[PDB]
Amino acid sequence: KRKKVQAVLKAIKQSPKKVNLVAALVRGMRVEDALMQLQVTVKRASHTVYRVIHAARANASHNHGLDPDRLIIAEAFVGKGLFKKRISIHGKGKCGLMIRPECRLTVIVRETTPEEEAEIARLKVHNFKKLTKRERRLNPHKLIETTPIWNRRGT
Amino acid sequence: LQAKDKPTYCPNRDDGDICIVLNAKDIGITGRKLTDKFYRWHTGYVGHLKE
Amino acid sequence: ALRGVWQLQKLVVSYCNWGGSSRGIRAFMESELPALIEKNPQLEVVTELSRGQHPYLKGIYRNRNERVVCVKNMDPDQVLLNATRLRNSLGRKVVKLRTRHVTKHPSVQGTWTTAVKF
């Protein structure tokens, strides 16, 4: 019934530019692919975007009856918050103005259409084609599952 | 080439005909322009005007 | 009138019987409205009272268009002139006239092409 489910986190103590630099990476990705990419991206904002995407999937599953295996990230954007004004002291008796920033993050998810599922199945076959940004965000990486093996007789 | 001889002339379009010029090595030149006319161009480096 | 079909259908006259801005439109109703009604049989003239508001003439056309002219603080001659302007119009939108000669067949003998022989 409900098409779009959102999750908002307020009062993050980081820069809106720095948060948006990671939030723009995961736009239009599937949820379980974005969650994997945020665990190998080495940034401070990766944990925050992980938390907000996790909460969005949980809200869609629990409150509004959506299927968690078929969620795609429609929107992910950053707004400002309460900036704190301090004074920076230079040499020669002069001063400037320093800002401690705060932001808010909003993540909006929706269910993948069957036509988009056919698109994903067409993209996952092998081809040498150059992919556009939408298709590359739909098929971002190759997931490889490995098991640990003791005494694999070699080196 | 400008399509100025067609009654449906519009300035902002490109509808000229295709010109095929034959025997370009037998063009006529009057006077002393063979030894007195020069083509000059500057290649961008200082002091490098060529003729 | 487009190909014989009159386009203005309803002429609403909204006024007020107390306020001072409706003196012109009030005096227009006793003087010029019966002549306009008599000379316009196909047109429907509607009269509305709205106390404490400014008066206007509203024209409702066949192509689902409404045009409102506020006639506050006016003379009966100006009110009649704007009623005539409402009657004489087709109700099309007020934009710039692109062309002053509208045709669908620009040529009878055929437009000049490159393959025309004489």
């Binding site: 630099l21 990419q37 190998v40 991206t41 599952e145 490995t146 098991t147 640990p148 003791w150 | - | -």
Partner: protein
């Protein structure tokens, strides 16, 4: 030296264009401990260690 004029939104966006992040082509997850890791990262050794 000081900037002569204010940098517009068009020029700021063009400058910050190539510096946006890009996704990682290969991602490995261990089937036992479930850690998401890059290639050449050690998480678990198998049984009878």
């Amino acid at each position: 030296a000081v900037p002569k004029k204010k940098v517009s939104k068009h020029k700021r966006g063009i400058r910050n264009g190539p510096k946006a992040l890009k996704p990682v082509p290969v991602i490995i997850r261990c089937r036992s401990c479930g850690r998401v890791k890059l290639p050449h990262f050690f998480c678990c050794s198998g049984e009878r260690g």
